[PDB]
């Protein structure tokens, strides 16, 4: 499955953190 269960804060928080680290650490527009 992929249910969040009772609480969904953790999934959203970890998605945001992983995505923001991916964006900052490897900027898409410019060379890293």
């Amino acid at each position: 499955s992929a249910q969040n269960g009772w609480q969904g804060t953790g999934a959203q928080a970890t998605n945001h953190l992983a995505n923001k680290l991916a964006q900052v650490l490897f900027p898409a527009q410019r060379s890293f």
Partner: protein
């Protein structure tokens, strides 16, 4: 860690906090669902009849 063949994730340090949040969230949700339900009541010897009511 030293002498370790595999790393450790960040969620390891706060799985406890995540579990606590889950517990409180399920408590709140279950309480809200319980309060949402209505049950209705009538006093014995009511001198009134539900069938016509």
């Amino acid at each position: 860690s030293y002498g370790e063949d595999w790393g450790r994730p960040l969620c390891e340090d706060y799985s406890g906090d995540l579990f606590v949040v889950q517990f409180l969230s399920e408590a709140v949700a279950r309480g809200a669902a319980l309060m949402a339900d209505i049950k209705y009541l009538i006093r014995p010897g009511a001198q009134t009849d539900v069938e016509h009511f």
